[PDB]
Amino acid sequence: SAADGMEGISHETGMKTWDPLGLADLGSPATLAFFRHAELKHCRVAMAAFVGWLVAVSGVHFPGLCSFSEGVSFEDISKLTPLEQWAAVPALGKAQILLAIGIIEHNSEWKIKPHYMAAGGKPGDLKGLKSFWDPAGLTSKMSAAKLERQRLSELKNGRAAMIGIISVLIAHNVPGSIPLPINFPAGPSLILPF
């Protein structure tokens, strides 16, 4: 397929690219670069989301208040289920969180001039946005083989994370999906952003 040189071949399905429906062949290398960038974005968001869901279930929260105007403490918001937490965040807070995220996304598409849908793709490459990814240089100690291993672990962990986040979100809402009898938190499986 077009997905041979790409760095996502796992050890669990074997060393062959798992594309049973052949979506990699359908489209251009630009299309496949878009797919890789989307996969890495979903991976990263799912890791962050699963950590956030674990935090919400645990109940640990920031000491303080979200808004000095509205009576919305983090202690108050922690008592709701994980998605009603976001539902209970203030509208202006949600607006500026989304503003920051959108600014990051626009600058990722803008300032990284060799685009992922272009020659010299670098699909998941967001380093170039200086001080954004790994500001402390933790990966700077790593060689090429170690970096390749870490990237493969990134994709594996994020794939598992995006499976798991959907699993926990739907398990209570539709009972019997996950065979485990653990009583998952109640609440929606989908929230509108505003």
Partner 1 sequence: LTKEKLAEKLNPAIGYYDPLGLATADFWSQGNDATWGFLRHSEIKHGRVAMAAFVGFCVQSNGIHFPFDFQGGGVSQAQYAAGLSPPEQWDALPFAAKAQIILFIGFLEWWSEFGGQHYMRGGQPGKYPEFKNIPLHKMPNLFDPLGLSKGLSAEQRETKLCAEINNGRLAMLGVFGFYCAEKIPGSVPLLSFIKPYAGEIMGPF
Partner 2 sequence: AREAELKHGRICMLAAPGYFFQEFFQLPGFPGYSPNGIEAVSSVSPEALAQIVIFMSVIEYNSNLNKWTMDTMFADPKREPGNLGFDPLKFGENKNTRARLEMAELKNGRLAMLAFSGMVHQTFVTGKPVWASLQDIF
Q: Is 21 exposed, middle or buried (0-12, 13-18, 19+ CB in 10 A)?
A: exposed
Whose CA is closest to 3, among 123, 115, 165?
A: 123
* C-alpha to C-alpha distance for 44 and 53, rounded to whole angstroms: 14
Closest to partner 1 by CB, 110 vs 132, is 132
N-terminal to C-terminal alpha carbon distance within the chain: 41
Least distance to ligand KC2 from the beta carbon of 95, Å? Answer: 8
Instruction: Mark 117-156 with x for binding to partner 1 (rule: CB under 8 A) and - for no binding.
Output: -------------xx---xxxxxxxx--------------
Q: Exposed, middle or buried: residue 164 (CB in 10 Å: 0-12, 13-18, 19+)?
A: middle
| Shortest distance, position 66 Cβ to partner 1, whole Å | 23
Residue 34 in contact with partner 2, rule: CB under 8 A: yes
Least distance (Å) from partner 2 to the CB of residue 2? 9
Vertex 192 angle, CA 73 and 159, to 5°: 95
Kindly tell me which of 79 and 149 has the beta carbon lying closer to ligand A86: 149
Among residue numbers 113 through 172, which ones bind partner 2 (CB under 8 A)? 117
Least distance CB 110 / partner 1 (angstroms): 18
Of the pair 17, 167, the CB lying nearest ligand A86 is at 167
C-alpha to C-alpha distance for 40 and 119, rounded to whole angstroms: 19
- Applying CB under 8 A, the residues found at the interface with partner 2 are 25-28, 30-31, 34, 117, 188, 190-192
